Design a protein around this ligand. Structure first.
Ligand code: ATP
Ligand code: ATP
Ligand code: MG
Ligand code: MG
Lengths: 407, 832, 11, 51, 396
């Protein structure tokens, strides 16, 4: 018998017992909210300046001139030269998206200046080739190359000396001393595919190779190589590799190859094959240019792209051994305010089967225990408390009641 | 619909209402008795909807009229109770109140808590609607508040109890009804409500809430309020009434921390100790004492502060070098540059550079009339005796924040206040003002009198002169000093006013009238004589000094108008206007945080003159308070194109971070130095900002608020106002010849520490759970006033907005609010 | 086994 | 009859005016400029009528 | 670096008992608000040209927005129209040849395509709504218990912004990226809504399903945009709630649609710790199932602190009750311990339903004061969807 609240009932519930300030106070809160709403609207529109230059560097009189005499020129590409009589060439130009047109030069250009294939500027009206244009420097690809050298040096990469040595004989050694790889005539592996458990040093052994490069290091995002419009993924792959051959001593580093390196499968009923044809435009491309690749999950890579004709070398970044974990530790603790004595060797045996990063968080948590309690020196007792939270706290159950079997 | 119980009750009530149709003898006494039972039974129940009131939807017209005719005696009154109770559910207030007014009395408790409160509201509603035109209605309403208020006191409804009395405009009775278990709830409430309440009720509340603290012998609490009202007489009584010396001792330590001095009669025992405590001679020993435990006795050097290593000797930057070796090492008792090779150091400062460097000598050693005065024995008499003003500021600065029985400031300074050289006098009057700020001593005030009238004195001598007098009589409206200031201000000529330093003359007028908006009506009347612009400018600035910390939205609305206006003689009036909002609104946190939004609007929608004042305005709002939102706001304007805004923003950052050692502010400060390395004016003050952010290695705060941010420090608010307004024109004042004005802050310079001592004054290291303070107002029981607890072993430091509580029940502090030095009385209740 | 499949849209 | 024709004649004139584009306003930009996204084409920094 | 565009929170009014102290404090906020409106409105009214007007005439109306691609000469650049074409437009004088960068979104003249202005702040509407403007209203005092979990989430998102000295004075790098995981209804999102009401840094939010667009590149490109705005706005926290939607365990999917979601995880997995290390952009993920996230997305280095939120303990459940029965009106007989003590796995969202229900069971009997039976009944009425599932009396 859940009696519905009669209108007579409602009137009393809301007035009987009401604190005499209730109607007023609830009024004040309601007034504020509406007042805040109005406050924003009167000022919410904040001017977004549009990048105008200082008043001094203006030529407004001449500016009206450029807009009036000069005209917009569609940028096109000469795909062929008919050379009708060798005196009336009748060039064929591609307007990109507009159409393919058989055009003729405006008198200003020279017949010999427009060589087949070079980007040519046309006029909106008749499409006469008014001006040659510099070859295409991709706005995205050009930003890809690492212009600021990463600060991580090779002394920061610990416990992977044999894996770094194996990489230095494919990415550095055959690029600084191309004489040991010639005497025996061994073809330098022109690419390594770093694989390992997530957080073992794949991209640190990547930034490290960048700090000592002497080359042009291109950091392939993975995201940019998958574009909405069909084909623009492959068009980027070519425009990256093309940007490498032009440079001397270029290194390309495709981090997270899984993004655009998934095992092929017919899914043509969808845009996935768009990405796949971007890889097949990369498989063709791969097979002085060295190529690196990182993949925490190598098993999802196309068998074709892992063959020893494209990725000649496959470096496995395993979990560090004990003599390396005590070294990965000292690398991250060289700047910590630790007490001189810490038995890092001891902290290496408490982090069994622990990666090169979870060792880092043990060093980062160790201080956080030293900051929680106001000690400016991160003593050893903190680390064991650190290794309990970073490694053990998420390692397994393996607990006392079920661990009194091991002694 | 209803049920057998509900439908029958509808009929039973229906029969009773209907039976009153005629005048039968057994219809009025019988029926009204029944309604009395049923209505009483349901209403005096759980919050259950009062079924009698829901069923009873009748009209009282028949019974109201016959009420008069039907037995105007008891039978008449009975009907009133039934109709009155039925009125509270409906909307007949005027009739609803007047029925209990005329109808049967009985007692309020018999009806129900819900009814009682409703009569409470109507009684307050009627009393407010009843003006002084007639008290005949007041006696009945007043009688009602006699009974109802005790009803709330018992029923955990003190909030409504205090609320009920405040509505009536009269809150005396709480004195007689507060129980030993209630004064905390009531006393806390009034202190929290007093700030918001407007004049003059706010003042009346403070004394009343102060009174309640009296009835239960909670003496230290009465102290905090007594100063809040800023009335010395009530302070003197509590001083006199405190038959316990220990409470006498403590209430002097709170009297001292406020900078308040009352001449102690020799009849009061331990007069020297009370005088020495009040004179603040014992402060130096603790401060050095505090340092030894904290291990911060070693002085710092400018180079380490700036950290020249990380970044990728002009006279000016030397001043910034000289200043940083002031504030940073100030009050530590030792500096590594200004105490050993100072003659060498200063000699690379041209005139005003010498003035600044010499003054820092005194600020490097504050609160030591001997050590500093002896650290005041190698420069002042310089071959460029122009620097005499420099040590004179140091001479005056050392005495600032303290009072010595031997009156050193007047002695040394007097012989040179008449010194003909203009620079020699600048240090004299200014330094003297710092030393006796708020003293209001008639002698020094009198001696400063001829300085105003000394025509030979240059204007810069005059502007400091009026400022010096103001800083001495801050917050007292001294008739003699005001007259001297008021008489002096009128005589000023129009041409001589147009200079910047005339901007200081009105400042002195207000500093005399800080905290009293009732008496400033006249002072604004007298100023009307002088011609504009400075008539209007002084009027606004005098207006601001009147309402320092009042929380008066009215004046703020008045002040906001001036800033809102879009006009050069109008911009000085605006600039003081924006700084006006900052000072007025900076009492309550609710308003003060809101002024930030208004400050922000004045910058995006502001104009040249306003945009310069806003960076200063934020400085007063959060002095020594690194609120990230405000510190960020100063930064985004810390690179601004106008030189004035860039400087003011940089100075504001220094104030906001004053003594906080905020790493972010420092890192923010360092990056700015690199950005502005080219411009000496910016680099000087950005370097200065790093100087203010390390005031006393952070062991000091310029915050003008003590006592849980409740007890205002009048002398303090004088200082910050001088530099801040003086910063209203930085280039002529700050960037000009007046680098010394920055020493104006020394008045409010106070320590922030948590040193706990045993009952014998030995440092008693007691676990003190100290964290962000959380209000206990409106929280039932023993609410925790500290959050984000971080147990510190006293002594400890409390960044602004922090409170420390004695985590060990071993001791019962005499004063409830653990700020500054507190006498911990060993708890007799604690048993090991 | 039997696998239901989603799909994107190359513009 | 006049009032009816006026309705018909007016609707003939209004009905020759070209229909307007519909585009999502990404954001206001000043006070007399509002970025819009016309459906088929791309961004446009248009003005705003006086009404 | 535009600086932290922190949320806009009006000060807080406490007391909550609806006492006059409350009305006054709301009035004070209103008074300044009325005053603040006065200045805005009285600034346009009190407030009552030949250089810019010439510029606006050269630009005309409207002005297209395409992507710059090459600065051929000082006064010539190739700009791609909003359709993907190209154009060899002219760079006029008023434009700043400094802000003009390849990839920048340039304002183009409509008739004769010619660079006329550089449109910074072109962040998608799909990521500019991700920014929290009006700060949520649940302060750390509304979250009961969770003192060990709160501190863990206050040493990565609040402290590293207030007292940076501690961390840089010790050699740590403040932990950056915390995975809030636990059973449903424990307080994962409330602790997140509480860091927004205290933080002073731009608090972007997502729902782990917003950043999966249908277009092939729309997905990974929104994530690359969100971490571009968070970095742009200086101190920032990106709260990807229900992260399980995007970052589940990678697998060889025979469905292209599912290979684009993973191509979005492998972007959030590189926009966090990959080449070209991050700046100051903390990330707060939440998830009820930490057992399905990819071992890489929660590998220490991206999600440094895995705050685990267990079902409330007996002491916390008693504090959780009061935080939700603070504004209620309990009768003197309401001794909450009768309900708390039970071994029922009463989550923290269950506690607020045993509060909403016990207050609605009060209206049933026509009472705004909830007695002790109003909780006993409500506990049962609110405790379904979990019935009783356990082993039989096998174990003794
Ligand atoms: N073996 C290691 N030695 C030193 N630092 C390491 C090691 N492994 C991880 N780190 C730390 O973690 C950072 C990044 O880890 P790492 O480069 O292994 O990521 P990753 O392998 O790319 O992960 P994922 O494959 O999931 O993207 C390094 O820059 C370093 O700070
Ligand atoms: N410890 C707690 N203290 C106080 N309230 C709590 C607590 N835990 C949960 N709550 C309440 O839970 C309500 C909603 O739960 P919440 O949003 O925290 O869940 P969640 O972690 O987002 O859950 P889900 O896994 O469903 O996304 C909040 O309104 C809050 O009042
Ligand atoms: Mg990587
Ligand atoms: Mg959630």
């Amino acid at each position: 018998p859940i009696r519905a609240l009669d209108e007579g009932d409602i009137a009393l519930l809301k007035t009987y017992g009401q604190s005499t300030y209730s109607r007023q106070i609830k009024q004040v809160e309601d007034d504020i909210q509406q007042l805040l709403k109005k406050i924003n609207e009167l000022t919410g529109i904040k001017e977004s300046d549009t990048g105008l230059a200082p008043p001094a560097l203006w030529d407004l009189a001449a500016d009206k001139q450029t807009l009036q005499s000069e005209q917009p020129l569609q940028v096109a590409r000469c795909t062929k030269i008919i050379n009708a009589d060798s005196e009336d060439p009748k060039y064929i130009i591609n307007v990109k998206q507009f159409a393919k047109f058989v055009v003729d030069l405006s008198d200003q250009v020279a017949p010999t200046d427009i060589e087949e294939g070079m980007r040519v500027g046309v006029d909106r009206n008749k499409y006469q080739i008014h001006i040659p244009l510099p070859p295409k420097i991709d706005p995205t690809v050009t930003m890809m190359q690492v212009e600021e050298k990463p600060d991580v040096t090779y002394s920061d990469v610990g416990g992977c000396k044999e894996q770094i040595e194996k990489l230095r004989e494919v990415v550095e050694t055959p690029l600084l001393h191309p004489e040991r790889f010639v005497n025996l005539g061994i073809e330098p592996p022109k690419g390594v595919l770093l694989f390992g458990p997530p957080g073992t040093g794949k991209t640190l052994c990547a930034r490290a190779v960048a700090n000592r490069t002497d080359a042009c290091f291109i950091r392939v995002i993975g995201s940019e190589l998958v574009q909405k419009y069909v084909g623009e993924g492959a068009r980027m792959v070519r425009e990256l590799f093309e940007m490498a051959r032009t440079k001397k001593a270029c290194l390309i580093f495709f981090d997270e190859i899984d993004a655009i390196g998934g095992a092929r499968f017919d899914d043509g009923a969808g845009g996935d094959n768009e990405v796949q044809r971007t890889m097949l435009e990369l498989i063709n491309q791969l097979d002085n240019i060295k190529v690196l690749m990182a993949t925490n999950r190598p098993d999802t890579l196309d068998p074709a792209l892992m063959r020893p004709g494209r990725l000649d070398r496959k470096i496995e970044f395993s979990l560090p051994d004990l003599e390396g974990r005590t070294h990965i530790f000292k690398i991250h603790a060289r700047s910590m305010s630790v007490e001189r004595d810490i038995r890092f060797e001891l902290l290496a045996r408490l982090c069994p089967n622990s990666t090169g990063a979870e060792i880092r968080s043990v060093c980062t948590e160790a201080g956080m225990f030293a900051i929680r309690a106001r000690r400016k020196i991160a003593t050893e007792k903190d680390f064991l408390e650190a290794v309990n939270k970073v490694i053990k706290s998420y390692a397994k159950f393996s607990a006392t009641p079920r661990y009194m079997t091991y002694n | 619909e209803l049920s057998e119980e509900d439908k029958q009750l509808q009929d039973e009530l229906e029969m009773l209402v209907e039976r009153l149709g005629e005048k039968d003898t057994s219809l009025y006494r019988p029926a009204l008795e029944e309604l009395r039972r049923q209505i009483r039974s349901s209403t005096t129940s759980m919050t259950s909807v009062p079924k009698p009131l829901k069923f009873l939807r009748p009209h009282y017209g028949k019974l109201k009229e016959i009420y008069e005719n039907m037995a105007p005696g008891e039978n008449k009154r009975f009907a009133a109770d039934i109709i009155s109770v039925l009125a509270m559910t409906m909307s007949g207030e005027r009739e609803c109140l007047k029925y209990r007014l005329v109808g049967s009395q009985e007692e309020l408790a018999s009806w129900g808590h819900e009814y009682v409160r409703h009569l409470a509201g109507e009684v307050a509603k009627e009393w407010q609607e009843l003006d002084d035109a007639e008290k005949v209605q007041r006696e009945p309403l007043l009688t009602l508040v006699k009974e109802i208020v005790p009803y709330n006191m018992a029923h955990n409804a003190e909030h409504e109890a205090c609320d009920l009395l405040m509505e009536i405009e009269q809150v005396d009775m709480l004195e007689k009804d507060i129980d030993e278990n209630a004064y905390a709830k009531v006393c806390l409430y009034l202190t929290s409500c007093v700030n918001y309440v407007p004049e003059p009720e706010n003042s009346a509340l403070l004394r009343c809430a102060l009174g309640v603290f009296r009835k239960f012998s909670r003496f230290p609490e009465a102290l905090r309020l007594a100063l809040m009202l800023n009335d010395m007489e009530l302070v003197e009584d509590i001083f006199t009434s405190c038959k316990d010396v220990v409470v006498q001792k403590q209430m002097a330590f709170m009297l001292g921390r406020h900078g308040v001095f009352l001449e102690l009669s020799e009849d009061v025992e331990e007069y020297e100790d009370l005088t020495e405590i009040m004179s603040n001679v014992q402060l130096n020993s603790n401060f050095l004492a505090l340092a030894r435990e904290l291990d911060i006795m070693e002085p710092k050097v400018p180079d380490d502060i700036y950290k020249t290593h990380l970044e990728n000797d002009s006279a000016r930057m030397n001043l910034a070098s000289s200043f940083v070796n002031g504030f940073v090492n100030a009050a530590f008792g030792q500096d590594k540059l200004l105490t050993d090779d100072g003659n060498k150091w200063l000699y690379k400062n041209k005139d005003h550079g010498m003035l600044s460097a010499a003054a820092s000598l005194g600020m490097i050693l504050l609160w030591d009339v001997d050590g500093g005065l002896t650290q005041i024995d190698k420069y002042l008499y310089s071959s460029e005796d122009y620097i005499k003003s420099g040590a004179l500021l140091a001479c005056g600065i050392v005495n600032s924040g303290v009072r010595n029985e031997c009156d050193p400031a007047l002695a040394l300074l007097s012989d040179y206040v008449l010194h003909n050289s203009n620079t020699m006098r600048l240090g004299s009057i200014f330094g003297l003002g710092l030393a006796y700020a708020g003293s209001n001593r008639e002698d020094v005030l009198t001696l400063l009198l001829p300085v105003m009238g000394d025509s030979k004195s240059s204007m810069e001598v005059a502007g400091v002169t009026a400022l010096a007098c103001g800083m001495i009589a801050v917050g007292s409206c001294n008739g003699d000093v005001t007259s001297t200031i008021l008489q002096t201000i009128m005589e000023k000529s129009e041409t001589e006013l147009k200079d910047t330093y005339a901007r200081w003359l009105p400042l002195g007028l207000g500093l005399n009238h800080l905290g009293k908006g009732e008496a400033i009506e006249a002072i604004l009347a007298a100023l009307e004589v002088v011609s504009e612009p400075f008539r209007s400018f002084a009027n606004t600035l005098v207006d601001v000094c009147a309402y320092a910390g009042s929380g008066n939205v009215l004046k703020v609305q008045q002040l906001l108008h001036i800033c809102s206006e879009h006009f050069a003689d109008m911009g000085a009036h605006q600039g003081v206007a924006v700084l006006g909002i900052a000072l007025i609104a900076m009492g309550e946190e609710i308003g003060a945080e809101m002024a930030l939004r208004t400050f922000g609007h004045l910058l995006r929608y502001g104009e040249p003159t306003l945009r310069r004042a806003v960076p200063l305005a934020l400085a007063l709002i959060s002095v020594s308070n690194p609120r990230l939102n405000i510190l960020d706001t100063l930064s985004k304007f810390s690179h601004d194109a106008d030189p004035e805004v860039s400087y003011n923003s940089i100075f504001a950052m220094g104030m906001v971070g004053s003594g906080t050692n905020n790493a972010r502010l420092a890192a923010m400060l360092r990056q700015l130095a690199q950005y502005h390395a080219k411009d000496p004016n910016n680099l000087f003050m950005v370097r200065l900002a790093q100087g203010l952010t390390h005031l006393g290695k952070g062991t000091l705060t310029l915050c003008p608020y003590h006592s849980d941010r409740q007890l205002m420090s009048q002398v303090a608010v004088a200082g910050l106002l001088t530099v801040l307004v003086s910063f209203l024109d930085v280039r002529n004042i700050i960037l000009g010849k007046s680098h010394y004005v920055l020493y104006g802050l020394v008045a409010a310079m106070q320590p922030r520490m948590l040193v706990t001592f045993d009952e014998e004054l030995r440092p008693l290291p007691v676990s003190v759970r100290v964290g962000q303070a959380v209000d206990v107002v409106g929280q039932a029981g023993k609410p925790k006033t500290i959050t984000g607890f971080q147990t510190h072993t006293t002594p400890v430091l409390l960044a602004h907005g922090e409170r420390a509580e004695l985590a060990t029940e071993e001791f019962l502090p005499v004063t409830p609010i653990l700020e500054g030095f507190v006498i911990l009385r060993k708890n007799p209740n604690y048993d090991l | 086994a039997x696998x239901x499949x989603x799909x994107x849209x190359x513009x | 009859l006049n009032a009816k024709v006026r309705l018909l004649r007016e609707e003939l004139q209004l009905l020759q005016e070209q229909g307007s584009y519909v585009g999502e306003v990404v954001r206001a930009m000043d006070k007399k400029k509002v970025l819009v996204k016309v459906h088929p084409e791309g961004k446009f920094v248009v003005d705003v009528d006086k009404n | 670096t535009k600086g932290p565009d922190a949320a806009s929170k009006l000060p807080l009014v406490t007391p909550h008992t609806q006492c006059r102290l409350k009305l006054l404090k709301l009035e004070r906020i209103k008074d300044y608000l009325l005053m603040e409106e006065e200045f805005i409105r009285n600034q346009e009214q009190m407030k009552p040209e030949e250089e810019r007007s010439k510029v606006d005439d050269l630009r005309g109306t409207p002005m297209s927005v395409g992507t710059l691609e090459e600065i051929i000469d000082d006064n010539h650049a190739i700009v791609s129209t909003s359709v993907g074409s190209e154009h060899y437009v002219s760079i006029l004088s008023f434009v700043d040849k400094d802000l003009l960068e390849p990839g920048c979104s340039v304002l183009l003249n409509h008739k004769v395509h010619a660079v006329i202005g550089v449109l910074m702040d072109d962040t998608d509407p799909l990521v500019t709504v991700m920014k929290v403007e009006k700060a949520p209203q649940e302060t750390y005092a509304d979250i009961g218990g969770l003192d060990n979990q709160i501190q863990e989430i206050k040493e990565s998102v609040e402290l590293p912004l207030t007292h940076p000295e501690y961390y840089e004075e010790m050699g740590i790098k403040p932990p950056k990226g915390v995975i809030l995981y636990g059973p449903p209804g424990t307080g994962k999102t409330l602790l997140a809504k509480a860091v927004a009401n205290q933080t002073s840094a731009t608090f972007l939010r997502v729902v782990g399903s917003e950043l999966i667009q249908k277009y092939l590149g729309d997905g990974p490109k929104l994530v690359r945009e969100l971490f571009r705005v968070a970095e742009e706005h200086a101190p920032s926290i990106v709260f990807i709630d229900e992260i399980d939607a995007i970052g589940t365990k990678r697998y060889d999917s025979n469905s292209g649609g599912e290979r684009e979601i993973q191509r979005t995880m492998l972007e959030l997995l590189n926009q966090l710790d990959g080449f070209d290390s991050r700046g100051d952009v903390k990330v707060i993920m939440a998830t009820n199932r930490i057992e399905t996230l990819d071992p890489a997305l929660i590998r220490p280095g991206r999600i440094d602190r895995k705050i685990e939120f267990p079902l409330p303990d007996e002491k916390t459940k008693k504090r959780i009750f009061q935080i939700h029965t603070s504004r209620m009106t309990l009768a003197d007989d309401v001794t909450l311990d009768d309900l708390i003590m039970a071994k029922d796995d009463l989550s923290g969202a269950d506690i607020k339903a045993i509060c909403t229900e016990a207050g609605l069971m009060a209206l049933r009997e026509r009472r705004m004061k909830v007695t002790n039976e109003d909780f006993k009944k409500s506990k049962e009425n609110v405790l379904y969807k979990k019935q009783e599932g356990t082993p039989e009396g096998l174990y003794l």
